[PDB]
Amino acid sequence: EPVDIGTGDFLQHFSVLSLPGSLPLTLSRFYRSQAKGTGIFGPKWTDEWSCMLTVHGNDMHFTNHEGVDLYYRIPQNGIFRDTANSRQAYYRLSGDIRDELTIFDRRSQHSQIFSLTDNGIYLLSAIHDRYGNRADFIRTEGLLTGIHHSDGYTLALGWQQRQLVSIDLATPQRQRLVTCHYDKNGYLAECDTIQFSHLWHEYTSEGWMTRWRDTDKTCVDIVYDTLGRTVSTLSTEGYFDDQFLYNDDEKCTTYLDAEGGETRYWYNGDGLVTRSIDPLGREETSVWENTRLRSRTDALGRTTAYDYNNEGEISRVSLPGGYSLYYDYNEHGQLTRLSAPGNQVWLWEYDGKGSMVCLTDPQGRQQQFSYSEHGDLLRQIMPNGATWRWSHDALHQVRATTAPDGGVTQTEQDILGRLLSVKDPLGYTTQFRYSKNHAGPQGSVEEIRRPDGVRELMRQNSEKLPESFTDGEGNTTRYEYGAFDLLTAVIRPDGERLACRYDKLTRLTEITNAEGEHYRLRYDKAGQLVAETDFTGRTLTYSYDAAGRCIRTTFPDGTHLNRQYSTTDQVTREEVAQGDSDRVLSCTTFIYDALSRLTEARNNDATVTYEYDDASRVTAETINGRRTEYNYDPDQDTVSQRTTAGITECFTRGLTGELTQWQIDGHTPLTLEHDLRGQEISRQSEAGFSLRQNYTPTGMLTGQQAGNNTLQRQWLYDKAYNLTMISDSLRGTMVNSVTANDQISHATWTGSSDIPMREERFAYDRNLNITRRQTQVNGVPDSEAYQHQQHGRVTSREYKAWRHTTQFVRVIRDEQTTWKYDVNGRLVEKLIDKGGYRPLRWRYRWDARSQLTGLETPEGERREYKYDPFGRRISKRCTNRDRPGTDFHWNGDQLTEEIPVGTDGTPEYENAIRWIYEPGSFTPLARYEKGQLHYTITDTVGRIQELLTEDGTIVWRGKQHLWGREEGRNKDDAPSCRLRFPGQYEDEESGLYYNRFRYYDCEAGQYLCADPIGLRGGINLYAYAPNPLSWIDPLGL
Ligand SMILES: [Zn+2]
């Protein structure tokens, strides 16, 4: 809101200073072009430190920090008592006009004290809270020259010729906070603040601001009509080339935005909008009662109603759909009860000072809060008795936190609230040091010293935006900005550039990657994104209803994905149609109960149902008749028990919610220990299995000891936290060299010989996608591949392999792979061609949602995959060969069961393999098949490296190439393990890693189709990760 549509005023509001404390001291400056008021910053600007009360006959005028005048009728005896103005009912005026006057703010529980000066004018002399924390305002020769805060600091305000030039912290430390200059007519021409903006302002003779600018890129020119109304704005970089039209007889203002849209606002006598029409003709109406909003109705006709109690607070909100929210307050305006649908009631209790001492949640569980006499929160007790404690420094900022397990965290902040140091419960200290640039453009440097010896530097520019970041290895990422703090470029440590361009309303319209290709976004007049064209040239088009809800996605092949919504903005139906035919190809339904909770999702291949308790916790998820049931800890709302097909698991948790015991199906329990930083140091079973883990000073996993029953593993990182060494008692030593982009360029595994057993050498293109992969085996070249991306996706690849003969090498393989994508960006064919041989061709079939529904192998075998309404693959079948299938059970996003299906289509539920996860975790803890329990040991990315029996016997060992190809050789009777990176499952018929929403090729390092969430997943629509030992992608997004 730069322009007040009801009056034509140009409006600005900027933070000036914000000091921490028991009673925070914050100052802002508010500008209105037609304003008649004044503040410490001179005419036209108002502020919190210049509020006043004025006698004007029989009423008292209250001028607030925005220059708004509120009227209070003076009683005959001249004594106010909880006197309210109906326009702003939360302000309560008390006191004898012969003594001193108090404005109490019911929203904040804070009070302003006004003292008689001259001519029946009362100036602000103090602000305080209900604890006596107080800021005293000192005026000399009529000017505010000092402030004393009861926390123990003072400010000094410096004036020259009755113009404020400086605001300083005076004691206990000297610090300039604000510096001001003025134009020839006394208007504020420049305001430099230490914590926020540094701006310049230009004005006409009347004080109408015709220009404002920041330190670098932002400069805006404003034009007024002769009546002082804003008629246009324009920045020097082209943004917000806007015009304003006025109609005083119709009471309708028109906003002509820079991209051709037209918005009309009808307003009432108080200048409040009663009817607006957006650039698409969509209409919104509001009903007002003395500045209080009584109802609003959107473009679909959905009405929200507001009721108020006798004290002026919102007492009831009627939401569309018949839902009501009820609010109750104590005598001071503090919220004591919130009643929501489903008989959900929140209760708050306050003591005599207004401290919230007891919260009762909708389940009737109580949290207790204890406070100091100055209002510091000292202690919180949770329903299960978990107790948090805090102590504070002289500015009442937290300096020590005692967690429920007794662990103490030490924090230190400066007078401006910047963090200076943290010491965690194990005694490891991280330090922060700040320094201001003195030469050149006014900027700053923040240095971070970490307890593992890592040093990082973050630089800010003159706008206090991040300018560069230098990691512990000295690699620097830089940032560039245009006007209005728009990020226009990111420069990687290797010097490659990512760039962004915006339209005249600052909507992102173009992204250019390091390769130099463009991603384009297109908007309608209301700012809705109606089209995007990715780097491949693929365009998706979007349609919207009157509420801005997206109701159709159109794909290049002509298929449409139609969506329907409930009154509460929930998807009730999804339809697939194609081309101009309105014929529905497929249909998906979503059913919701009376509380708008999802109870059933259904497509052609799966019905998924959910059951809820009164607390809206999920007590059961059922997929195609297979039911998982949950029970919950009554104090923590964590899963305490889950049962599927008569197999029950029990979870025991400590005060912090950490897992202390896990048990399945009457087996010996697994017990777990955690350190004072909440990190797991051991898991044990009395049967014999034992795993101990240790961490770096910054909490990186760095050590594992277990105990064909003994494992010793060490992980070492560089100062940028790339994993550069693995010492593995079962595998050898892995050494990784990294690029400036934190990608691994050389990965070697070494045994007891100096010559490495195997090496991978990688190169990457400008987009960081794989190009070269060379392997060596025992020091001699083994294979070499070179793959080529076009528009960010692998398109072809050459591969050779060598045989070591006799000291020479002869080529034994030489083949080219080509990839073909359809117009929707999905891989439909991968062709491997070695000269003189039969071709090896994979074909891929896809549905409208870009789910891989079919696969054809080079030998002609056909597989079919089916998916539930949430993209979870529920089945796999071979349709033309005598081969078994698989059914899949899920809990939420976790694959919990693979169920073998015989060739006749009969599921073998007794042969199910259960993968055990903590609820909502992607890191597997155990495995249960045919009554046999195995425990996992996982690596730094949560991938299983070993499976162990209950007594600790190692019966499965993984062995991988960098990008995930698993080739570990294990005994015939070893348990199967098809899990790979988090959320991945290897399909043995293809070698693909199924990865929830997409399939992953661990050779090319890429997914087989474009990211279904587009740019929301990053700018590399096919990549998996820049470094598979540092990043994960469990949903395939
Ligand atoms: Zn008056």
PDB file of N, CA, C and O and ligand atoms in Angstrom, residues 56 59 61 71, ligand 1:
ATOM      1  N   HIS A  56      -9.124  20.292  24.014  1.00  0.00           N
ATOM      2  CA  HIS A  56      -9.745  21.123  22.997  1.00  0.00           C
ATOM      3  C   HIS A  56     -11.184  21.372  23.454  1.00  0.00           C
ATOM      4  O   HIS A  56     -12.153  20.884  22.882  1.00  0.00           O
ATOM      5  N   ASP A  59     -13.383  17.943  25.035  1.00  0.00           N
ATOM      6  CA  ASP A  59     -12.856  16.647  24.642  1.00  0.00           C
ATOM      7  C   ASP A  59     -11.333  16.683  24.628  1.00  0.00           C
ATOM      8  O   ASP A  59     -10.711  17.744  24.534  1.00  0.00           O
ATOM      9  N   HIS A  61      -7.959  15.179  22.680  1.00  0.00           N
ATOM     10  CA  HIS A  61      -7.504  14.627  21.409  1.00  0.00           C
ATOM     11  C   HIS A  61      -6.242  13.804  21.619  1.00  0.00           C
ATOM     12  O   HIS A  61      -5.254  14.302  22.169  1.00  0.00           O
ATOM     13  N   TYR A  71     -10.897  11.033  19.811  1.00  0.00           N
ATOM     14  CA  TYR A  71     -11.562  11.964  20.712  1.00  0.00           C
ATOM     15  C   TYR A  71     -12.075  11.237  21.948  1.00  0.00           C
ATOM     16  O   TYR A  71     -12.629  10.138  21.850  1.00  0.00           O
TER      17      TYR A  71
HETATM   18 ZN    ZN B   1     -11.777  18.853  19.810  1.00  0.00          ZN
END
